[PDB]
């Protein structure tokens, strides 16, 4: 409207992080060395998708709380356009209000991403039956995104911070059941006006 | 307690069997001690432990000397720099401790001391490291330790004359003899995938680094008498094992002479990853 | 025990709890730190003082 | 009077006392074992237990802070 | 659901512990000094892979009890989906409800990690024929994890605690036949609400 | 399925020495002693045990004519088709018996004593060298457990024969000088694998 | 003689009245400059130089249908396999034989082939026979024509 | 900015000249001095004495050092363990390293022996003590050099 809440998120990895490469060209040119490349830019920095994590966190917690929210995670499941996740993150009609940027790292691939040996060990003979190579973002890497809610209907920052606490407990990225993706967020919000750039 | 102003306690009572009594004072009993935020005066007939007493004289000492079971500590508040100090001196004379109002700090240093100006103290120049859960205070021998660590890692990262065009007198045997020898020394487990891979890794860093690698795997130690080759798989005699190791040395040294494309195309028929 | 109670001191006779915790306050600036060998380190030159219930590390300004 | 029994059950690792307490206990313990045998009551420990107790016996005097 | 079981695991080593380095850069920049590095974080703590030990423990135990648990240890095995290990730790379709963290240590690698010298002794010369070095975690070192079951069933603590006795009698990672990895587990469970950050 | 649980209890009948493997502990101790004992951070004494049982059964079964490999010669690859490779391990297929480190039942300050050793010249009968080394007392009790995963029949018998071999020759180091003569007691049981499941 | 400092001088402490920071890096020399570049620079230069070095039979037409149907049902030939096989077929015919030999290549140290293991209770000789059947079936398909190889592989991987 | 570091030990990686460094960037009056580990030890002693207050090595040439070290490593007087401990005490400082070599070379007045490993091979007593004094003089003359040159000398005899 007249103002815009500018959430500035800073995330530190407390565990190895994995989010997989989405680019087919970049993936297939990496299967020569690594079986599981990470999502990386062409500026050699690591992308993590953030919006869907925030929306999944708020939809799970808000279904649990007793509020009425839509499940935009099932096959052939449409949004409602009446829920609070349909207002904050969007429906098939009205656009979302939070423009959640990617979690782009502050370092390059050569300083955060390492190849790592992963195993499948036979349960009887206690010996490795499969080996594969994954890429992983190290612990202590700092990623930065920027949520930007237009028409900042109050309770936004509280919902976003509750979703970040959920992502902190559960994880962001892949292999989230093995110990990967455990993070720590650091919010620094604001309320700068829409007209800010006009000189 | 947290002396914000307005105090705090841990429930976060901002000032638990609480009971009020006329200050002419709140008695917050907790399992961790029975606090008594006296407030302003200008008293519980039970167990006090901490007496948060607002100093703003003899009347305060009278108030203190009517509480059964004299308090362990008496936090003095609501006074100036001199007022809370002079009341403190008087209360120390009555054998009662005063107190004039995150990450653990773990000091890892010595315990020598002094008795300097009634303030037991010790001079320390050192370092303060901040691990996630703690802030250790450690001495300079720790800094020497991490300096030896970084020096003995930093000098093992440029081996010199590496990735550089220079220079030799390396032996000679045909591409078909190199292929035959590498085949035989891969069937018997002398040249392995790890050995071929590390030879290629040290070959990319120049011919000289590959010569240093190969003379480091062929060095018969004068004490033990063990070359660092993988031992052969079979029933060879000692002279035959010596000849096989010598053939491995000569074959790899001769392969160093050939250009990088030929070395790759010879050594990806025996180890596909480099 | 009755006379020690009369002198205002707690008595636990052997037929029958404040959490005293000596703390170590830092009391020196911790904003300007550096990293050398994956350690957030900072050189200081100061004084370790041993007070009751409290061991304070205190800068040269205190001295 | 029960230090050599803790040495017997190996529950004690250091026995700190004053030097005079060490030298006096090297009379009391031997006298207790002598009395225990001479009164024909199953000995609470042995002379070996006393000797091992003085093997793990460190001594420190007054006003000397040990940091253990 | 409206509840989530949070098991806070505290592990104490009773024997030297070795879990070897997986990061190829870190292994190749530590096999200049120690032939067997331990896997470490970039925050200089020690990671131990926990999920697969729990899955292996319950798989070996519940195949012996006579239940219908599948083997995911044999090479490129498909997890079926219709057992308790597939419910708790994951199938190909569904993901596991138990989100097992790593066993990150509480202390750093200068208070817990020591370099040892192991040997290979000739049997007719009674003398060393090989010498290697290894990194290991000391006895009495404390590691912490948090298993987080998302749709909490009843037999889901009594299975994760029955696996944690199997990883006390066998070992957690590394050279478990020589005597390494003998540990002790301490569990303080709790069933939080899912919406505990929303409120 | 079942599992064998051989609990072994070892009483030292002689002074014992196992050298400290940890380099930091060896450097810290080697300003006082010249030969430290292998000590846990919980101040207990840790002897290696798998290599002794494996070497015992290898030396014994090579004398009975049985096809056992040598894992003691330099960088020898284990075979995988032998009883020692079944019970202690091969390159692929781990050993069925998880042999624990022989941890003492008592602390460093009750069972470990500093000792003075000499080197006497043969013609002047005078001490040429003196070296202090730590040794475990006679009477110290060390407990280990052997956990055979897939139990066969002869595993307990061969483990007990290896224990009799270590009872004769020794555990640890300095064995030529009389160190490490120990006695082993065995209590085995066949536990169920699903015995932790309620 | 000119010295350039390429280490960030922000996180700097104060000791002995002197501002200082322990730095861990590399002194580099050029024809006009003596610079101080961090470990990150040496990682960039090392990977740049390493990348510079790196930059230098006969069956029926229905037997094959039944075979690929069986190997798709028991999960050893999958849509991924068929996609990679078609990608190598578009690269030519010898490359398809190369890919299929690499997939069928039994490692002599582990005794494993890169195929997917079959579903169901099969003996080890049966699994080896199904491995050989997959190898022979696709090798026979490399001898057919492109449109036909499309027509047989469609009904299994419709995307490719 | 000013370099107070010897620019020797410069290797050749790719088409660049490098030297691996580990030091302190002191800043004062825009001089921004890139010092070494030896300035800071002095400056540390300055502050340590300031807090605690208010309460000639023989010059043998490099080739002679290498030749004597090669001979004394082959008669087994300078062992790998000896070279490693000399490296540790040189890392601890020059005074500690002189103290260590003096400790090793000291003939005990009671036993008549020194803590060097005895020369392997047949010698006489005068030759044996001459070789011991050569070990003393060579290592004491090594203390005179800097840490990088001592590392490069000793790494070709004990890696
Ligand atoms: Zn909605
Ligand atoms: Zn299953
Ligand atoms: Zn064998």
- d(CA G55, nearest CA chain H) in Å: 15
For residue A139, give the nearest of E1, E42, E148 by CB distance: E42
Question: Residues B143-172, buried b or exposed e (16+ Cβ, 10 A)?
Answer: beebbbbbbebbbeebbebbbbeeeeeeee
Instruction: Give the ligand with the smallest distance to the CA of F57.
Output: 3
Q: What is the resolution of this structure in A?
A: 3.0
Residue A172 CA to ligand 1 centre (angstroms) = 22
∠ CA B195-B200-B206, nearest 5°, is 130
Q: Does B20 touch chain C (CB under 8 A)?
A: no
Does the CA dihedral H110-H116-H118-H121 come out positive or negative?
A: negative
DSSP line for G12-49: -EEETTEEE-EE-EEEEE-SS-EEEEEHHHHHHHHHHH
DSSP line for B80-110: -TTHHHHHHHHHHHTT-EEE----B--EES-
All residues of chain E having their beta carbon less than 8 Å from the beta carbon of residue C38 are: 42-44
- d(CA E195, nearest CA chain F) in Å: 31
Residue A147 CA to ligand 1 centre (angstroms) = 19
* A neighbour chains, 3+ CB pairs within 8 Å: E, F, G
Q: How far apart, in whole angstroms, are the C-alpha atoms of residue E36 and residue F21? A: 14
Instruction: Give the ligand with the smallest distance to the CA of E80.
Output: 2
Contact present, B32 and B17 (Cβ < 8 Å):
no
Query: Residue G108's CB: how many other CB atoms inside 10 A?
Result: 8
Contact present, D1 and D23 (Cβ < 8 Å):
no
**8 Å CB contact of G112 and E78:** no
Identify the closest residue of chain E to F59 by CA–CA distance. Answer: E123
Q: Does F77 touch chain B (CB under 8 A)?
A: yes
- d(CA H159, nearest CA chain B) in Å: 11
Q: Does C38 touch chain E (CB under 8 A)?
A: yes
CA-based radius of gyration for chain F:
19
∠ CA A72-A77-A79, nearest 5°, is 55
Q: How far apart, in whole angstroms, are the C-alpha atoms of residue H81 and residue H84? A: 5
Query: Residue C61's CB: how many other CB atoms inside 10 A?
Result: 9
Instruction: Give the ligand with the smallest distance to the CA of A77.
Output: 1
**8 Å CB contact of B153 and E29:** yes
Q: Does E25 touch chain G (CB under 8 A)?
A: no
Q: How far apart, in whole angstroms, are the C-alpha atoms of residue E91 and residue E76? A: 13
Contact present, A141 and A48 (Cβ < 8 Å):
no
Instruction: Single out the residue of B102, B110, B109 nearest to residue B137, CA to CA.
Output: B109
Please, which experimental method was used? cryo-EM
Residue A79 CA to ligand 1 centre (angstroms) = 5
Identify the closest residue of chain G to E78 by CA–CA distance. Answer: G119
Residue E92 CA to ligand 2 centre (angstroms) = 9
**8 Å CB contact of H32 and G5:** yes
Kindly report the length of chain E. 199
Q: How many CA atoms lie within 13 A of E127 on its CB side?
A: 2
Count CB pairs under 8 A between chains B and E: 7
Q: How far apart, in whole angstroms, are the C-alpha atoms of residue F17 and residue F46? A: 11
**8 Å CB contact of B106 and C24:** yes
All residues of chain G having their beta carbon less than 8 Å from the beta carbon of residue A110 are: 40, 43-44, 47
Query: Residue H96's CB: how many other CB atoms inside 10 A?
Result: 14
Identify the closest residue of chain B to E108 by CA–CA distance. Answer: B131
Q: Does F74 touch chain B (CB under 8 A)?
A: yes
- d(CA G112, nearest CA chain A) in Å: 9
Q: How far apart, in whole angstroms, are the C-alpha atoms of residue F113 and residue F165? A: 26
**8 Å CB contact of B204 and G50:** yes
3-class SS letters over chain F:
CEEEEEEEEEEECCCECCECCCHHHHHHHCCCCCECECECCCCCEEECCHHHHHHHHHHHHHHCCCCCCCCCCCCCCCCCCCHHHHHCECCCCECCEEECCEEECCCHHHHEEEEEEEEECCCCCCEEEEEEEEEECCCCEEEEEEEECCCCCHHHHHHHHHHHHHHHCCCCCCHHHCCCCEEEEEEEEEEEHHHHCC
For residue C43, give the nearest of G11, G13, G23 by CB distance: G13
Contacts of H132 (CB under 8 A, 6+ apart): H77, H105, H114, H116
All residues of chain G having their beta carbon less than 8 Å from the beta carbon of residue C43 are: 13, 15, 20
The residues in E 15-74 lying below 8 A from A, measured between CB atoms, are: 22-26, 41-43, 45, 47, 49-52, 56, 59-60, 63, 71-74
Instruction: Give the ligand with the smallest distance to the CA of E84.
Output: 2
All residues of chain D having their beta carbon less than 8 Å from the beta carbon of residue F106 are: 10
G52: which DSSP letter?
H
Contact present, G11 and C32 (Cβ < 8 Å):
yes
All residues of chain H having their beta carbon less than 8 Å from the beta carbon of residue C46 are: 51
Q: How far apart, in whole angstroms, are the C-alpha atoms of residue E31 and residue E37? A: 7
Q: Does A110 touch chain E (CB under 8 A)?
A: no
Contacts of B140 (CB under 8 A, 6+ apart): B125, B126, B127, H44
All residues of chain B having their beta carbon less than 8 Å from the beta carbon of residue E29 are: 153
Residue H101 CA to ligand 2 centre (angstroms) = 67
Instruction: Tell how far CA F12 is from the center of its chain.
Output: 12
Distance from first CA to last CA of chain C, Å, rounded? 45
Q: Does E76 touch chain G (CB under 8 A)?
A: yes
Count CB pairs under 8 A between chains E and G: 8
Query: Residue A113's CB: how many other CB atoms inside 10 A?
Result: 25
All residues of chain E having their beta carbon less than 8 Å from the beta carbon of residue B153 are: 29
Q: Which two tokens stand for residue B274?
A: 């480099």
Q: Which two tokens stand for residue G34?
A: 């003596």
All residues of chain B having their beta carbon less than 8 Å from the beta carbon of residue F75 are: 230-231
Q: How far apart, in whole angstroms, are the C-alpha atoms of residue A131 and residue C31? A: 45
Pairing mode of beta strands D15-17, D57-59: parallel
Contact present, G23 and H3 (Cβ < 8 Å):
no
Contacts of A58 (CB under 8 A, 6+ apart): A69, A84, A85, A88, A89, A159, A162, A163, A166
Residue H132 CA to ligand 3 centre (angstroms) = 50
The residues in A 122-181 lying below 8 A from F, measured between CB atoms, are: 124-127
B and C interact (at least 3 Cβ pairs within 8 A)? yes
All residues of chain C having their beta carbon less than 8 Å from the beta carbon of residue H47 are: 45
Residue A55 CA to ligand 1 centre (angstroms) = 10
D and C interact (at least 3 Cβ pairs within 8 A)? no
Q: How far apart, in whole angstroms, are the C-alpha atoms of residue G133 and residue A194? A: 67
Kindly report the length of chain G. 160
Interface test with G, best of H5, H12, H21 (most G CBs within 10 A): H21
């Amino acid at each position: 409207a007249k103002t815009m809440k500018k959430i500035y998120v800073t995330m530190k990895t407390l565990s190895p992080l994995y989010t997989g490469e989405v680019r087919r060209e970049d993936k297939e040119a990496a299967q020569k060395r690594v079986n599981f490349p990470v999502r990386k830019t062409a500026t050699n920095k690591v992308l993590i998708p953030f919006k869907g994590a925030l929306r999944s966190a708020l939809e799970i917690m808000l279904k649990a709380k007793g509020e009425n929210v839509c499940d935009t995670g099932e096959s052939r499941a449409r949004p409602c356009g009446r829920c609070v996740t349909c207002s904050l993150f969007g429906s098939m009609g009205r656009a979302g209000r939070a423009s959640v940027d990617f979690l782009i790292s502050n370092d390059t691939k050569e300083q955060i991403v390492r190849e790592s040996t992963h195993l499948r060990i036979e349960r009887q003979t206690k010996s490795a039956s499969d080996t594969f190579k994954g890429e992983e973002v190290i612990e202590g890497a700092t990623f930065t995104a920027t949520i930007t809610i237009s028409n900042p209907q109050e309770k936004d920052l509280s919902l976003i911070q509750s979703a970040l606490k959920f992502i902190e407990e559960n994880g962001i990225g892949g292999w989230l059941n093995k110990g990967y993706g455990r993070v720590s967020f650091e919010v620094k919000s604001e309320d700068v006006a829409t007209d800010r750039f006009l000189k | 307690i947290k002396f914000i102003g307005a105090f705090l306690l841990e429930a976060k009572i901002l000032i638990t069997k609480i009971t009020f009594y006329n200050n002419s004072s709140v008695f917050i009993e907790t399992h961790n001690g029975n606090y008594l935020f006296s407030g302003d005066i200008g008293m519980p007939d039970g167990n006090v432990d901490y007496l948060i007493l607002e100093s703003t004289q003899d009347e305060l000492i009278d108030y203190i000397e009517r509480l059964k079971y004299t308090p362990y500590k008496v936090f003095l508040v609501h006074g100036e720099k001199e007022q809370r100090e002079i009341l403190a001196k008087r209360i120390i004379s009555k054998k009662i401790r005063v107190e004039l109002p995150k990450k653990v700090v773990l000091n890892i240093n010595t315990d020598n001391m002094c008795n300097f100006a009634s303030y037991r103290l010790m001079p320390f120049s050192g370092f303060i490291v901040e691990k996630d859960d703690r802030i250790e205070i450690n001495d300079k021998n720790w800094f020497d330790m991490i300096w030896n660590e970084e020096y003995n890692k930093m000098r093992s990262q440029i081996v010199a004359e590496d990735f550089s065009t220079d220079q030799m007198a390396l032996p000679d045997m045909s591409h078909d003899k190199i292929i035959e020898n590498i085949e035989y020394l891969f069937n018997i487990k002398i040249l392995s995938k790890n050995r071929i891979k590390e030879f290629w890794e040290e070959f990319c860093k120049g011919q000289k680094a590959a010569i240093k690698y190969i003379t480091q795997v062929h060095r018969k130690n004068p004490n033990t008498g063990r070359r660092n080759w993988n031992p052969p798989e079979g029933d060879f005699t000692d002279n035959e094992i010596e000849k096989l190791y010598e053939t491995a040395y000569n074959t790899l040294l001769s392969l160093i002479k050939y250009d990088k494309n030929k070395v790759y195309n010879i050594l990806i028929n025996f180890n596909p990853k480099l | 025990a009755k006379r020690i109670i009369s002198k205002k001191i707690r008595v636990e006779l052997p037929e029958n709890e404040i959490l005293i915790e000596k703390k170590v306050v830092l009391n020196i600036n911790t904003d300007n730190m550096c990293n050398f060998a994956s350690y957030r380190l900072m050189p200081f030159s100061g004084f370790i003082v041993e007070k009751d219930d409290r061991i304070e590390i205190n800068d040269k300004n205190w001295f | 009077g029960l230090v050599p029994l803790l040495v017997k059950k190996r529950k004690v690792n250091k026995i700190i006392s004053t030097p005079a307490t060490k030298e006096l206990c090297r009379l009391l313990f031997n006298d207790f074992q002598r009395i225990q045998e001479e009164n024909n009551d199953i000995p609470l420990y042995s002379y070996d237990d006393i000797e091992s107790s003085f093997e793990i016996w460190d001594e420190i005097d007054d006003r000397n802070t040990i940091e253990l």
